[PDB]
Symmetry: D2
C-alpha cells in the first residue's frame, strides 16, 4: 500500500479562539497499523495562547488507528486521494471549538491542514485560566452516515484540584475516494489515549503521542 508501517506527517493549522488568532505547525511520525504516533508542535503566530493548549489536542490524525478484528479501515483505504474531517467539540461550560481538516499524501508524507474556530469560552473558566491537565482515555463510536463516517465521542479534561470538565465531539469523516471503491465498515469503536509527552515555553512547543485501536464490543450476546 501507499501507507507503510512507518510514516511521517507535516501539519499546518490556522485558527481563532474567541477573539485570539494563532497559527501552528507540527511534524510527527508514527506506526499506522500499530496505531501509535507522535506529533511535535510549534505555536508560530499568536503565542503564547491565552487558552489551554489542551483544547487543540484533538485537531492535530486518523490514518494511525490499528484496526482489529477485520474492521475495514476507511482512512487507510482512502489513499492516494485522501480524506477530510469536520468536527464540533462542545464543552459543558459553553465553550465551542469547531475544526475542519484536510488529509493528503504527497511524496509519501502525510499532509494535514486544519482551520480552527472556537467561540464563547468563558473568560473566567478553566480553559482561559489554564487550569487544565490533559485528557483521559476515550472511546469514539463510528458508523456510516451522510456519505462518509460519523463519529461520536465524549472526553473528560483533567482539572487542577482533581476535577473534570466534560465535552462531546461530533465528527464527519469524508473520503475523497468514490464510495464504490471503498469497503465500508459497519458500526465500531475506537479506543484512544492522547498524552502530552513534553512542553516548553508557555505551551508554545508541545509534544503529543496517541494510541488508537479499533475494535468491536468484546462482551457476549445472550
Amino acid at each position: 500500500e501507499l501507507i507503510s508501517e512507518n510514516m511521517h506527517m507535516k501539519l499546518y493549522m490556522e485558527g481563532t479562539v474567541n477573539d485570539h488568532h494563532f497559527k501552528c505547525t507540527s511534524e510527527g511520525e508514527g506506526k499506522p497499523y500499530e496505531g501509535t504516533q507522535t506529533m511535535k508542535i510549534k505555536v508560530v503566530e499568536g503565542g503564547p495562547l491565552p487558552f489551554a493548549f489542551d483544547i487543540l489536542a484533538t485537531s492535530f490524525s486518523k490514518t494511525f488507528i490499528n484496526h482489529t478484528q477485520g474492521i475495514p479501515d476507511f482512512f487507510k483505504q482512502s489513499f492516494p486521494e485522501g480524506f477530510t474531517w469536520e468536527r464540533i467539540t462542545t464543552y459543558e461550560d459553553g465553550g465551542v471549538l469547531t475544526a475542519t481538516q484536510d488529509t493528503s499524501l504527497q511524496n509519501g508524507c502525510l499532509i494535514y491542514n486544519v482551520k480552527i474556530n472556537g467561540v464563547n469560552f468563558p473568560s473566567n473558566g478553566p480553559v482561559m485560566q489554564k487550569k487544565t491537565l490533559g485528557w483521559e482515555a476515550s472511546t469514539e463510536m463510528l458508523y456510516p452516515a451522510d456519505s462518509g463516517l460519523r463519529g461520536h465521542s465524549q472526553m473528560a479534561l483533567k482539572l487542577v484540584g482533581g476535577g473534570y470538565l466534560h465535552c462531546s465531539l461530533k465528527t464527519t469523516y469524508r473520503s475523497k475516494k468514490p464510495a464504490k471503491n471503498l469497503k465500508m465498515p459497519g458500526f465500531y469503536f475506537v479506543d484512544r489515549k492522547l498524552e502530552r509527552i513534553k512542553e516548553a515555553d508557555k505551551e508554545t512547543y508541545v509534544e503529543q503521542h496517541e494510541m488508537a485501536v479499533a475494535r468491536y464490543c468484546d462482551l457476549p450476546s445472550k
Copy 2:
C-alpha cells in the same frame, strides 16, 4: 447485603409526549458477574405508540462487574440504597428524562422510576416503530455534584441499516453518608443491553444486560 444472586422488583410510571403509561417488571441477576434479566409488562397505556427501545435504560446499577479494584459506589450504598436522574437526548429532538429510586427490602432490590419524554417527532423512527434495539455502549463515570456523574452515548439501530444517536447524562447519588463510602475516581462501564423476548406489540418485553467496570486497557506514555 447483596448476594451472588439477587431478585428485583420494579414499578414505572410516565408520560411520553402526551401518552401516559405504567410498567412493572421482575428480574433475577448476578451482581458481581454483572448480568441480569428483567421481565417487563406494560400494565397501563399499552400498546405504547412509541418504540419500547426508548425505555430500555430505565429498567439497574447494582449489577455491574466492578473489576480491577474499582470501588463500587452502588454495591457500597446498601442497606440505604441510591438514586439516579438522567436525560437522554436524541439527535432528532426527542428527549427522555428519568428519575429512579433503588432500595433493598428483604433481599429484594426495589426500583421506582418516573419517566417524562417530550418532543419525539411525529413522523420519526421512534414514533413510527422503525427501531431494532441498541448497539453496545460505554459510560464514563467520575465524582461530581456530591455523587457520580455518568456520560454515555448510544446508537439505536434503524430498519434499513442506519442509526439514530442519543447522549445520556446521569447523576447517581448514594443514600449512605459520604463519610461511609469509598469513592472511585474516573472509570468506564462497558455494557450490552439486548431484548431477548417480546409479545403483544411490545407490551411484554424481556431484556438482558451485561455490564463490566474497567479502566482503559491501552499502554500509557
Copy 3:
C-alpha cells in the same frame, strides 16, 4: 364559546427535581382575552424545596394569551376538549427540567395537571443554592409542527450578585380537537412577563402573575 372574559383555574402538580419529590396545588383567576392571570401556589408535599421555585414558574397556562392582529388562537379553539403541552427547559449550567401538562375544562373551571422531572441541577449552581431572583421578559416563537404547535423561547434568570443564568425552552402544544376542526396559525410570537407578586414561608406559598400577548413582528418589510 366556553372561554369567558373572566375565568378560574385549578392546578395539581407532581414531580421530582434531581432526587427531591414534591407536590403543589394552585388556584388562579385571569382574563383570557386580555392575556393576564394570577396563580396562587402552595407547595403541599416536599416543602420547603431545596431548589429555587423559579425553575417551576413556567409550568404553572396558555389559554390566557391575548391573540392580536387576528392570529388564530390554537388554545381557545381547542375547548371544550382541551389540549396538552410538553417541554424541556435546558439551563446553561447543566440543569434540565421537563414537564408534561394536561389542560381540561370542567364545570366552567380550567383544570391543569402537570408532571415535572428535573435532573442534574448542579449542587453549586444558583438553583440548588437558592440564589436566583426571578425572570426577565421573554418572547416565544411558535409555528405549526408535528401535528400541533412548536414553541421556542429563551429566558434569563436573575441572580443574587447580578448577572444571569440562561435557559432555552422547546415545547410542543397539542390540541385534543381534530385538525379538520382547527384554524391553524402560521408563524408568530408571544411576548410575556411572568412576575412573582408574593411569597411566604421559604417559597412554600407563591403568587405569580403573567401577561402574554401574541403578535407578528411589526417592522416594515421589503
Copy 4:
C-alpha cells in the same frame, strides 16, 4: 462623533462549510441610527456554493441597530477602536456554523473581516439540498457577560414545501474599548428582519437588507 447618519461598509469573508471552501466580499451602506442597511455580496472563490446561502446571512453588522429608549449602544460607543464578535449557530438537524468577526473603522469606512467554519450539515437536509427560502423575523436578547455582551437568539428558516428549520444563536460581543470607558447596557432586546432583496448566478450574487431596533419589553410590570 465618528458614526454618521449615513455610513458605508466593506467586508471580507473566508470559510469552510463541511468540506467546501469559499471566500466572499461585499459592500453596503446604511443608516446606523435608523438601524437599516443593505449589503451587496459576491462569492469570489468556491462558487456556486453547494449549500444554501441562507446559512451565511447572519455573518455579513451590529453598528446599524437603532438603540431606542436610551439603551446605551455598546457598538457605537466602541469606535474608533471597534469591536469583535464570535457566534455559534446550531441547526436542529445537526449542522453547526461558527463565525468570528472583526469590526474596524478605517477612513470613515466600516470594515468587516469574518471567518466561518460550519460542520456536519446533513446531505439530505434543506441546507445541503438548497431547499430553503430565507429567514423569518427574530428577536435577540442581550446582557453583560464575560467582559462583553452575550446575545441569544433563535431563528426559523423557511423551507420549500412549507414548514421550518430551527436554529439557535449564541454570541459574545467584545469591545476594543476598556470597560471603564464604556457605559454598559443592562438586559435588552433587538428585533430584526433580515431579508434577501436580490440574487443572481446560483446565489453567487446576493443583496440582503436588515432592519434592527433595540427596545425593552413594553408590557407593563406589576413590580
